[PDB]
Amino acid sequence: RSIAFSRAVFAEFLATLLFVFFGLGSALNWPQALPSVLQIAMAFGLGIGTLVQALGHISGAHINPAVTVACLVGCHVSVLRAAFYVAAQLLGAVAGAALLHEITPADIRGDLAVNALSNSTTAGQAVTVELFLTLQLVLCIFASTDERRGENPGTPALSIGFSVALGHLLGIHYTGCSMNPARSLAPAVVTGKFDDHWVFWIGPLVGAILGSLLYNYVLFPPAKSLSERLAVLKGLEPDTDWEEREVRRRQAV
Amino acid sequence: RSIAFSRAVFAEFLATLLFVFFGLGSALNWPQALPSVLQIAMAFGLGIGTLVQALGHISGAHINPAVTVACLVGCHVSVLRAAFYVAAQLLGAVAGAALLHEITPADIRGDLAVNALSNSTTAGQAVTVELFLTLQLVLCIFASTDERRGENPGTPALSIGFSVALGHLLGIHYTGCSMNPARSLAPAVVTGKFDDHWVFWIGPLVGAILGSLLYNYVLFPPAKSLSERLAVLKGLEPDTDWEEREVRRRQAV
Amino acid sequence: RSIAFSRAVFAEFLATLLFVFFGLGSALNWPQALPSVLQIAMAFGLGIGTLVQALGHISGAHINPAVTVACLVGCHVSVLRAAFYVAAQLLGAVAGAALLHEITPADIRGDLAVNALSNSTTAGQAVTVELFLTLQLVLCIFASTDERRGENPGTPALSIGFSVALGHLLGIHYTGCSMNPARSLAPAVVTGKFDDHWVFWIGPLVGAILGSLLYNYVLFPPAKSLSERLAVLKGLEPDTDWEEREVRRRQAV
Amino acid sequence: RSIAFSRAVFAEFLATLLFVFFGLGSALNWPQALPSVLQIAMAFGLGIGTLVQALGHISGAHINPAVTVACLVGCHVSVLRAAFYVAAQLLGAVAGAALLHEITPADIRGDLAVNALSNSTTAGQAVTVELFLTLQLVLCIFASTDERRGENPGTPALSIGFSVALGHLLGIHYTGCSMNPARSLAPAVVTGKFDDHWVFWIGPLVGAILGSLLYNYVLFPPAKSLSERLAVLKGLEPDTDWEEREVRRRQAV
């Protein structure tokens, strides 16, 4: 402790401020012109894609606590680097979310794009949808940040962005799409609406972990943890058969 | 038999579950907000693009039996690996398709995006459209998975995704766009609607094979099958002319 | 004469069939659902992007006579390879355009997306717009096919596609956007509507050439034509100054 | 002075002509069909992405004085090369903007997409939004033009384009989105509407500089300016401790 990391820690702060600012803002109920699911999907997806590009080298652009946690369960980040990230992400989030409230005229800042269950979907259903929404993202982020595969280097930024977008295309009708506890918290804070908030903390965290676990373990990534104690296996591994050869011979004598 | 393949087999299962879940879901008749052709095009196209990215290394992301079959006619996959894929794809498909029925409120899960002929288009026409819809995809997938060309490495995921999207942009008005027997089966199963189902099994399979055949044979890919018996040609190849030289000389004597 | 070229010649045929089929089809006046400028923009742009990807290695994916001509004025293609391309492009075009008429129910195949002046725009204006629409494309195609720059290898397919898209986003309101004499001819043929057809042959050809000329000459590409006769310059180049040195000395004596 | 630079200077002229021509044009109030926020977002974003691709090698495709200035504050361009750029950008801008007025029928060229405060947003708010709109772009442009990172070479053109797009998705509702003093000036000129024009010169310039400063200094880019006088530090750096060792010893004697 500590060096460039502090700045990297910062980078996330700038990222989640920006993403939430643009994101929520682009999803408001503008009376003269009203946001379509796609546009709102594009806006976030592009927002992330843009950030993962900008700050990808500096931070890994988690830009999302669930992603961070996914990165943690998968042992891609420190335990310290995780906490500082989430902290910044939550703070960076409510920062932009406030800047937006200030920047927007009173008539149309209504909801502020808080995450909220729609079409009579149960918090039980809703949370299920959020689970998958994030996992799919986590699966993308990992395949594209995966060092093992640099031959298909492109395209972590754009692919992720559009993954996020894909999340929205479905997850809006159920929830308006959190995928990102930071994202869903900031507006809930400023606006005071915490209805079924937990949904946007469990669905993501759960899908994100599952995601992390499947890529890190269910599929990939072959390597040796070295703590597997492969020195014990090699003692019996040849010797047990030598023993069978050696012990069966001495039974012969 | 058998190793990582089993997992790869799995990967497809996860892929077709996800793609169909997001896909159908994003194409439902949401009363408050209704899906435009583009959005529904983007949603699938992005879904595939995202998957080919995520699971591309693990599976080849066929995510489609017609693609798999295309890959088979083109000798890009095993005969065993094909069957297991299709199996998983069909099962992975109806899996997400069910998860969606459960997750969606009763009022708006109506059709469930089953594939169904629209605008008084004949199953004869419809099937013709599906033919081309898939071929074009198959042509893309191959050009982008083509090993011979790594200099233009990018961009198999995004290009494929958007290819899929391109498929939808037209194939929706005729059929709502199958390109993918798995995709069109899952909803037909759960919903019981099997009207003109065959269309979504023949159009794709046919276009996919054609596609596979043109890239594998009509154009490319120069290599030697070695079973061409090029050892017989080389016996006559020089010697026939030596024979003409040698036999015309001995006619001179 | 002749080898793989014949097939490459073919590749264009398959490309322009496909692009026009999907393209026109996706831009028809569907009564139940009607195409927005974007969707129609995306549909073509994606169509090209997809093709340049699929057949890029085989053909260069001109997919457009104006592009071909641009490639000709820029000396990127043979004079023979050009003609065969254009021929195939025109034939490939009217081929898909027919397939579409056959595949589409009578009620909604109306216009068939023929190119036609809109919003009381003069053929004089219209043609001007088409000029720029294509040049911009030609400028993109060249920068992305430019061998001199392989460090930024990506992304010829996607960038071109979206360039095409960009063309449509503006060129639809003026003309429905030709950029491609093949594209605008096929529907004019089948439908019999040749109103102001020339516009879609001059605007493109003109913008395409201009485009070709600026990249090939106004900017780039440094190389030696060797016919510049740089052997004459090198005789005077040093010797004229030696002569000044040598002749001024002998004037001194 | 001077060589290819003159042409490069030109390249910007061609770029800002094109971008503004397509851009404004695609954002006009077309009566029969009216531009959605996305489409207008796509149109510019694609326009830039296309240009950064086409002319990226020749110019750096600033295509924007604020970007240029950002590039200046960050010492990425000459002081001379900056001025000529801005000059050309402003002139290239009003050039296309005029070409558009001439090309468009009188009924629908109304606003001409001038930048203008909307939804009762204060020039104070408005300018704040513009600040962030550009910074985010500047952050992207730099991360993607950053030489230090060629391993993730892609994708400067597309990522930038879509960054621009992201700018529009939000910045339209507040201002119709300038991000680009050139862009906002051209229409204000031709149309005579200079209402709150300053907003579109301060917001961008301010966000662009901030952006430039954070990437150039707050984060990155490790290098040595050599004017840091690291020769003074190295005199005391070892010697001060040798002095402590040497001076404490002589105090011992």
Side-chain angles (χ1 to χ4, degrees), chain D residues 138-167:
Chain D
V138 168
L139 289 187
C140 196
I141 301 180
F142 283 140
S144 58
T145 58
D146 191 339
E147 156 204 357
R148 318 290 56 202
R149 228 46 191 239
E151 92 303 5
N152 186 340
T155 43
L158 285 176
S159 298
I160 292 176
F162 288 136
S163 175
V164 157
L166 175 62

Side-chain angles (χ1 to χ4, degrees), chain B residues 119 125 144 166 170 173-174 220, chain C residues 30 43 53 58 100 103-105:
Chain B
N119 319 27
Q125 290 166 308
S144 58
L166 175 62
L170 191 94
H173 304 108
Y174 293 55
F220 284 96
Chain C
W30 305 69
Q53 169 89 350
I58 302 94
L100 172 53
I103 210 55
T104 306

Side-chain angles (χ1 to χ4, degrees), chain D residues 135-250:
Chain D
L135 172 160
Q136 69 95 200
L137 174 59
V138 168
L139 289 187
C140 196
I141 301 180
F142 283 140
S144 58
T145 58
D146 191 339
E147 156 204 357
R148 318 290 56 202
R149 228 46 191 239
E151 92 303 5
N152 186 340
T155 43
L158 285 176
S159 298
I160 292 176
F162 288 136
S163 175
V164 157
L166 175 62
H168 281 22
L169 286 200
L170 191 94
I172 279 177
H173 304 108
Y174 293 55
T175 62
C177 198
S178 176
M179 298 183 54
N180 193 329
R183 137 80 175 91
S184 63
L185 173 60
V189 171
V190 166
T191 190
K193 317 265 290 186
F194 274 84
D195 317 58
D196 314 294
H197 205 250
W198 67 271
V199 176
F200 323 129
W201 276 76
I202 298 315
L205 286 177
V206 172
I209 294 179
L210 264 48
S212 177
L213 284 177
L214 314 208
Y215 195 83
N216 281 65
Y217 303 98
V218 175
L219 281 63
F220 284 96
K224 325 165 91 164
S225 71
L226 315 192
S227 180
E228 204 278 314
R229 75 249 195 72
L230 28 282
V232 60
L233 283 81
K234 91 205 318 88
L236 295 167
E237 171 166 29
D239 301 19
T240 47
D241 294 342
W242 295 342
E243 179 182 347
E244 296 294 349
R245 301 186 211 174
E246 302 293 344
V247 172
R248 299 172 184 177
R249 294 179 205 169
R250 297 180 197 177

Side-chain angles (χ1 to χ4, degrees), chain B residues 37-38 119 121 125 128-129 132 136 139 143-144 152 155 158-159 162-163 166 169-170 173-174 215 218-220, chain C residues 7 10-11 14 21-22 25-26 30 38-39 42-43 46-47 50 53-54 57-58 99-100 102-105 156 158:
Chain B
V37 176
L38 192 65
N119 319 27
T121 73
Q125 290 166 308
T128 310
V129 147
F132 295 97
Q136 69 95 200
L139 289 187
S144 58
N152 186 340
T155 43
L158 285 176
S159 298
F162 288 136
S163 175
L166 175 62
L169 286 200
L170 191 94
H173 304 108
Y174 293 55
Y215 195 83
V218 175
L219 281 63
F220 284 96
Chain C
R7 85 229 307 214
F10 164 75
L14 189 53
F21 186 80
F22 292 65
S26 305
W30 305 69
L38 192 65
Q39 170 180 313
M42 283 296 279
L46 290 232
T50 299
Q53 169 89 350
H57 25 49
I58 302 94
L99 267 36
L100 172 53
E102 259 47 35
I103 210 55
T104 306
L158 285 176

Side-chain angles (χ1 to χ4, degrees), chain A residues 119-120 125, chain B residues 101-111:
Chain A
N119 319 27
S120 41
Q125 290 166 308
Chain B
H101 180 223
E102 259 47 35
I103 210 55
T104 306
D107 299 342
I108 31 62
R109 60 191 181 179
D111 44 327

Side-chain angles (χ1 to χ4, degrees), chain A residues 7-8 10-11 14 17-18 21-26 28 30-33 35 38-39 42-44 46-47 50 53-55 57-58 99-100 102-105 107-108 153 155-158 162, chain D residues 36-38 42 119-121 124-126 128-129 132-133 135-136 139-140 143-144 146 149 151-156 158-159 162-163 165-167 169-170 173-174 214-215 217-220 222:
Chain A
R7 85 229 307 214
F10 164 75
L14 189 53
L17 190 170
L18 298 198
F21 186 80
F22 292 65
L24 296 187
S26 305
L28 302 176
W30 305 69
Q32 259 22 105
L38 192 65
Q39 170 180 313
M42 283 296 279
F44 287 69
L46 290 232
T50 299
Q53 169 89 350
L55 305 192
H57 25 49
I58 302 94
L99 267 36
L100 172 53
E102 259 47 35
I103 210 55
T104 306
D107 299 342
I108 31 62
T155 43
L158 285 176
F162 288 136
Chain D
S36 80
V37 176
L38 192 65
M42 283 296 279
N119 319 27
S120 41
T121 73
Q125 290 166 308
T128 310
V129 147
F132 295 97
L133 287 186
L135 172 160
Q136 69 95 200
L139 289 187
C140 196
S144 58
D146 191 339
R149 228 46 191 239
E151 92 303 5
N152 186 340
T155 43
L158 285 176
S159 298
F162 288 136
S163 175
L166 175 62
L169 286 200
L170 191 94
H173 304 108
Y174 293 55
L214 314 208
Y215 195 83
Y217 303 98
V218 175
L219 281 63
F220 284 96

